[PDB]
């Protein structure tokens, strides 16, 4: 497949959120993998602080792993 993208759900976040991994392929910027998160409204965001600030009141994600998308 072209532009293959992964899609793993993150139980740490409220039902409706999902995670996705995309492999870069731009000259030296290749090999690098970027992770994007999507909310129930389909909002695309890529920032740890935004995940905690957004779901802050809903819950604490300070101990959430953004690189691995896992709760530790």
Curated annotation (Swiss-Prot):
Documented effect of changing residue 36 to A: Augments DNA binding activity, irrespective of DNA methylation
Modified positions (Phosphoserine) in chain numbering: 58
MBD domain: residues covered: 3-72
Region of interest: Required for interaction with MBD2: 3-72
Signal peptide (from-to): none
Domain of life: Eukaryota
Subcellular location: Nucleus; Chromosome
SUBUNIT field: Heterodimer (via N-terminus) with MBD2. Component of the MeCP1 histone deacetylase complex. Component of the nucleosome remodeling and deacetylase (NuRD) repressor complex, composed of core proteins MTA1, MTA2, MTA3, RBBP4, RBBP7, HDAC1, HDAC2, MBD2, MBD3, and peripherally associated proteins CDK2AP1, CDK2AP2, GATAD2A, GATAD2B, CHD3, CHD4 and CHD5. The exact stoichiometry of the NuRD complex is unknown, and some subunits such as MBD2 and MBD3, GATAD2A and GATAD2B, and CHD3, CHD4 and CHD5 define mutually exclusive NuRD complexes.
Function comment: Acts as a component of the histone deacetylase NuRD complex which participates in the remodeling of chromatin. Acts as transcriptional repressor and plays a role in gene silencing. Does not bind to methylated DNA by itself. Binds to a lesser degree DNA containing unmethylated CpG dinucleotides. Recruits histone deacetylases and DNA methyltransferases.
Annotated protein name in UniProt: Methyl-CpG-binding domain protein 3
């Amino acid at each position: 497949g072209s532009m293959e993208r992964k899609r793993w759900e993150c139980p740490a976040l409220p039902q409706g959120w999902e995670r996705e991994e995309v492999p870069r392929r731009s000259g030296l910027s290749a090999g690098h993998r970027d992770v994007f998160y999507y909310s129930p409204s389909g909002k695309k965001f890529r920032s740890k602080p935004q995940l905690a600030r957004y779901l802050g009141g809903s819950m604490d994600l300070s101990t959430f792993d953004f690189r691995t998308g896992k709760m530790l």
